[PDB]
Amino acid sequence: MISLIAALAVDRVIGMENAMPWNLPADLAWFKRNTLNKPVIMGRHTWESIGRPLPGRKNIILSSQPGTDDRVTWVKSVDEAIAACGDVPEIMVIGGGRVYEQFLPKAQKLYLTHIDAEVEGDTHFPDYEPDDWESVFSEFHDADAQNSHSYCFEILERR
Numbered sequence: 001m002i003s004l005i006a007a008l009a010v011d012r013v014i015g016m017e018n019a020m021p022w023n024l025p026a027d028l029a030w031f032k033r034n035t036l037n038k039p040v041i042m043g044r045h046t047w048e049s050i051g052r053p054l055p056g057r058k059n060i061i062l063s064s065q066p067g068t069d070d071r072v073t074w075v076k077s078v079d080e081a082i083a084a085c086g087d088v089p090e091i092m093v094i095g096g097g098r099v100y101e102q103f104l105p106k107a108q109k110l111y112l113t114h115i116d117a118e119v120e121g122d123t124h125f126p127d128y129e130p131d132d133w134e135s136v137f138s139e140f141h142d143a144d145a146q147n148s149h150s151y152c153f154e155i156l157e158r159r
């Protein structure tokens with residue numbers, strides 16, 4: 001089973017200039033809980049944005065060019081990325097925009113955080129047909145002293 005996890009600002013913005021400009025610790029804690037002990041697939045730009053291996057997860061990087069770091073697994077196509085994960089229950093795809101586009105048709109579940117923030121960005125989450133997806137979990141949180149915007153965690157499953 002393939003799942004995508006992402007955090008979206010208004011208008012589905014996910015990034016600007018290879019970064020995420022907001023800071024929502026509760027969302028990063030949600031990301032860690034839902035990815036720990038699973039393989040994570042990311043594109044090369046996202047790998048450079050994170051800047052280090054994510055501990056406790058098998059890190060698989062898509063790139064057309066040879067890898068430059070043996071602390072992670074480098075693959076050259078979508079099918080190779082999936083194969084490198086082996087026989088696990090759930091594969092997590094953690095972006096970015098181009099990678100989300102390619103795995104969306106293959107995904108059974110979406111873990112989405114909707115952030116109430118207006119962000120100029122240059123990268124968007126793919127348009128997804130709403131009729132294809134059932135919301136199975138949602139949890140709204142107001143802003144607090146640690147998280148400066150309100151946010152909604154949502155899990156959707158392909159119907």
Ligand SMILES: NC(=O)c1ccc[n+]([C@@H]2O[C@H](COP(=O)([O-])OP(=O)(O)OC[C@H]3O[C@@H](n4cnc5c(N)ncnc54)[C@H](OP(=O)(O)O)[C@@H]3O)[C@@H](O)[C@H]2O)c1
Pocket residue numbers: 005006007008013014015016017018019020042043044045046047049062063064065075076077078094095096097098099100102123
């Ligand atoms: N808000 C969120 O949840 C979230 C999550 C993740 C990322 N982001 C943001 O997303 C942005 C990065 O997204 P992006 O769309 O620019 O890049 P990306 O999807 O992270 O990476 C694209 C690169 O991945 C490689 N790639 C993708 N598909 C491939 C394939 N089928 N075969 C071989 N290589 C492949 C290519 O690397 P080569 O050029 O080396 O071939 C491609 O240039 C940043 O702003 C980041 O902060 C946000």
Ligand SMILES: Nc1nc(=O)c2nc(CNc3ccc(C(=O)N[C@@H](CCC(=O)O)C(=O)O)cc3)cnc2[nH]1
Pocket residue numbers: 005006007020027028029030031032046049050054055094095112113
């Ligand atoms: N829901 C969600 N929110 C995000 O911000 C997000 N970001 C990415 C890409 N960027 C990043 C950047 C940093 C870390 C990171 O350092 N995570 C630590 C959290 C501990 C901490 O620094 O607070 C981790 O161990 O997972 C992960 C993804 C991919 N999917 C996401 N999904």
Ligand SMILES: [Mn+2]
Pocket residue numbers: 077079
């Ligand atoms: Mn092939």
Ligand SMILES: [Mn+2]
Pocket residue numbers: 086087
């Ligand atoms: Mn197998």
Ligand SMILES: [Mn+2]
Pocket residue numbers: 116117118148149150
């Ligand atoms: Mn806000």
